[PDB]
Every structure is written in C-alpha cells, then in structure tokens.
Amino acid sequence: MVLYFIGLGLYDERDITVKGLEIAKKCDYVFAEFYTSLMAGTTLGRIQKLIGKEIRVLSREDVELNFENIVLPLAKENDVAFLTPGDPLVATTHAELRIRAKRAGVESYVIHAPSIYSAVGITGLHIYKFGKSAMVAYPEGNWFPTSYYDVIKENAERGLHTLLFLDIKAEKRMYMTANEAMELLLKVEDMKKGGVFTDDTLVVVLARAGSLNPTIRAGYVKDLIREDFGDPPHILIVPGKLHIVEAEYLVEIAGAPREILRVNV
C-alpha cells in the first residue's frame, strides 16, 4: 500500500527517469493527468506501452474533488502510481494531494522528472538570476488578469529574469503561445503604462523544451510578436539585466540581435 507521484518529463515518454520507470512498471494501478501541461512528443499509448500497464486518465475535477475517492482507496491495499507531465509538484497544486494521502493513512513518494522550471537553463540565462515567476492567464469574460505584469516589473527593478508560464486549457485543447502572451502584455502596458513591456522589450521564447530540436529565440517584442515558434507548449521569459555571457549565448544560440552584446552596466 503506497502512492507514487511520478513525473513523466517535458516532451515525450522517454523524459521519465529510470527510477520512475522501474517503479511504475511494478505498480498495481496507474493513474495520470494531462491538464497541468502538454507533452507534445508522445501519446497515452506510447506511455502505456513503455510502462506496460493500462493508464487511467483523470480530469482536473477527478483529481481536485475526488482524488481521495478514486485513487487513495486503491493505494490502501496496493501500490499505486499517479503520473503527471514535467515534475509532479511544479506549478501545480498536486503537493496538497500528499496531505490527503497522509490523512487517508497512505504513504506517498515523489519521483521527480525534468521540469520546464530548470530547462530554462538552455536559454543561456543564469538560472539563479530568475526572480519571482508568474502565469499569464487567458482573459475570461470581463475579468482581465494582470498580476503577471507586476511580477515582471518587480523583477526587472532588481535586475532579475522573469519566467512566465503560459495558460493551458487541456479540455478545449487551448495552449497559449508566446505570441498571445506578448499581445496580452502589450495591452496591459497600455492600461498601466509603466514602461514595463513594449515593442522594444527584449524577450526569450522557449518552445517544446525536452525535444531534441526545441525553439529557442531571443529578440525585441516588435520583431518576435508575429514570429512562428512551432507548436506548443511555449514559455515566455523577460530577462532582467544581462551578463555578457548570457548575451553572447542569446546571440549565438537564440539568434538575438548582435546589438544586445552591448550591455548597459
């Protein structure tokens, strides 16, 4: 009787750790969710085949309201696994599920996996220099979210980089692109006018991290806002003050304008 939270990784079924695979392979029951993120390089079948077990997919409602009614009961007499994209506890509310397991008398274990949060390192931006992170949510009705704009502002004042997770509506299959995120930010800039996000703002786009050929691009908003970065998922990053080597990488690897080599210390 035990519950394993197992991350599947960034892009395909092979992004799971060897540890996670060995353990999943020997679990009696296997559950999973695919609404917290998008694994653009695989399918449920490829995952099932790799693990050699049938996988029951749960919706956000199944988890958020019935985790203790669907999964925990089984973990009382067997070994159960709960799979998720990336790392199980990053930019999700899955950590609270460990409390539910406790209160149900079920020991739980976490098997980590590559997360978009650390894969940002491939942009060449020093990961220790990232500050508060934010999520850009699709506007709904007359409710128009803007908190992520202040996050960028606060970080930028401190010279820190900002990681912006992009919205995802799995059931509708809506995956916010870096372009849509850029458009939303420009609209918030007009509203607040704090000189935080403009056509001249340098940004970095990372698409489909985890694949062997992700899209890594850096440039000014005015030039990237209409560029095609391939299929989702995408993340947007607003760098803070750049180090010479960060800029060198952006130019050499992310194709940024050579003029950013000239940093303003």
Add this chain to the structure above:
Amino acid sequence: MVLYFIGLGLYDERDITVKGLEIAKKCDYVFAEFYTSLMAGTTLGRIQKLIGKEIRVLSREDVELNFENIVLPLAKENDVAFLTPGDPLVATTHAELRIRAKRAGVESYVIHAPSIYSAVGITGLHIYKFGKSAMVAYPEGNWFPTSYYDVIKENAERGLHTLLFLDIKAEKRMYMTANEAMELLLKVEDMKKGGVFTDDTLVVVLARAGSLNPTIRAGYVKDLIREDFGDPPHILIVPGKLHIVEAEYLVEIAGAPREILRVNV
C-alpha cells in the same frame, strides 16, 4: 559530429532519464564531471555499469579551460556525451560550452533531467514564489562573503522564498551542512543586524532530494540548528510569508510546528 549534454539527475544512477540513458549508450565516448555537484546516492562505478561505457571524469579545469581540446575534438567524428549532475546547463558556466561547440562546428543537443531547482517543490513551497537564488560559502582567511544574506533580505522583503545552495569541496568530498549554514547566517546577522536571520526565523531543510527517503524538515532556527538532517547534500531555504496551503504541507509533511500556521501565514 554530435555532442550530447546529458543530465544525471539528483541522487543516484537511476535519476538519469530513459532518453539520456539510451543516448549515452549509443555514444562512442562518454565524459562526466562531478565538481559542480555530487551524486551522494551512487558511485562512478555504478553509473558506469548502468550505462555500459567507460567514463572519463573531467575536472573543473579540464572543462573550463580545455573543453575544446578534450571533448570537442572527439565530437567532430563521433557521438559524444557529457554527463553532469542535475539538469544540464543549470550550472552558470555550462551554457557557454554550447557556444564553444558551435564555434568548433559541432552539433550539440541537451537531454534534461531533474534539478534541485524544481525538486524543491517537494518542500510544499509554491515554485512561483522563489526569488533570486544564492550560495552560502565558507569564510576563509580574510574573506567572509555575505551577499547571500542580502539575497534573503530582498526576497523576503517581497514575500519571496530564497533557495540557498550550500558550499561543497567536491574534490575533498566535503559537504556544508544545513547546521553549518545556519550558524554562518546567525553570525552574519550578528554583523549586519538587519533582522533577516535569527533564532526565530523559519527555515526549511531538504536533504538528499531524489532519494525515496529524503529528509524534509521545517522549523525555527533555534530548534533546528542542532538537529541531524542525515547525510548530505543539504539545501537550505528561507521562506517568505507563507500561503496557508504551504504552511499546512510544512506541518503535515515536514513536521513543522503548528506555530507557523499563525506566525508565518
């Protein structure tokens, strides 16, 4: 003609991803480095046996000064792997190595794996709330670095959590403990009197992330400064004001005293 930056993960030889293991097995040459960090839950022999390839270990100088003389030449006419603990390119100097590869006419690909930056999610702290990260270094001679202290001050000033990497003498396999880190911080507090780190400060200690039996402890400095958190490596975190959900996890999963539910929320 191809260089693969492959991550080994967090603790043992099973923390490498399936994608990384298979790709390393198809490589003609395999290098590794264990100066940026160490795999406390395994050995070079076990990693070697798992990959089924002889592994040549490179020192900090081998990499930083002669990467293009030791690794790249072979990468010109072969598939070469460069293994590193955690997720590739997280260590601040590693990204630049891709520029050297390009400059050498060598194609490079990054194969991700779990990093402590994302793994700390198991502490129950929301990942978006982490601010700038720092490293606590051992003082030596007339040198007593304290900038990591200011990092905590600025993060906590904004309700942000601070991730503190602890010093390590990889060569001498000497791990700074969470306890030593706290003593150092108290000392710095005594010298800067900024009211940033005191006996009443709440902290979180994460030891052996990646293991099935990691140590997750949360509490006040005065009660944890002499507690035994087990074998290294240790990671220290100074949380900013907590979200009730975070506090509940620290209490239920990390054994934090109920006092944080009213004092740190």
